[PDB]
């Protein structure tokens, strides 16, 4: 799987309260986190399915 | 080489058999193996080496 999938979730410097999905490598599946609205990193998905397709076993 | 020889890096706490712990043996990086009592919530369901002999013969 891509290396960016192993990075911690990044809320960022903005103040929005948007729920996004990130792949948690310790658990082996995608979980939710709060995203601030700007400067997203790559481990940040709008749907769990897209997150698993990208990071589940790629 | 079997990945089961390597203790998962995130496992820190051990659990006694009276609380569901299961004994496994992993390589120790010093020519041998050491026992580790795996907590139910950390266990992957894999069939880890269950004796010192099996770990020593497969991992060292």
Query: Structural domains in chain A?
Result: 1-58 (4.10.410.10)
| Three-state DSSP class for residue B58 | helix
A23: closest CA among A6, A1, A47, A40? A6
Say how far residue A57 (Cα) sits from the centre of its chain: 15
Is B39 in contact with B14 (CB distance < 8 Å)? yes
Say how far residue A28 (Cα) sits from the centre of its chain: 13
CATH fit for domain B1-60, picks 1.25.40.10, 3.40.50.2300, 4.10.410.10, 1.10.3720.10: 4.10.410.10
Q: Please name the residues in contact with B33: beta carbons below 8 A apart, sequence gap of 6 or more.
A: B25, B26, B27, B49, B52, B55, B56, B59, B60
Give the C-alpha separation, A30 to A52, whole Å. Answer: 7
B25: closest CA among B14, B17, B34, B16? B34
């Amino acid at each position: 799987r891509p290396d960016f999938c192993l990075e911690p979730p990044y809320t960022g410097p903005c103040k929005a309260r948007i729920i996004r999905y990130f792949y948690n490598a310790k658990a082996g599946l995608c979980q939710t986190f709060v995203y601030g609205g700007c400067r997203a990193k790559r481990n940040n998905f709008k749907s769990a399915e897209d997150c698993m397709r990208t990071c589940g076993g790629a | 080489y079997n990945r089961l020889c390597i203790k998962p890096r995130d496992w820190i706490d051990e659990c006694d058999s009276n609380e569901g712990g299961e004994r496994a043996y992993f390589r120790n990086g010093k020519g041998g193996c050491d026992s580790f009592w795996i907590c139910p919530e950390d266990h992957t369901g894999a069939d880890y080496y269950s004796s010192y002999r099996d770990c020593f013969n497969a991992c060292i």
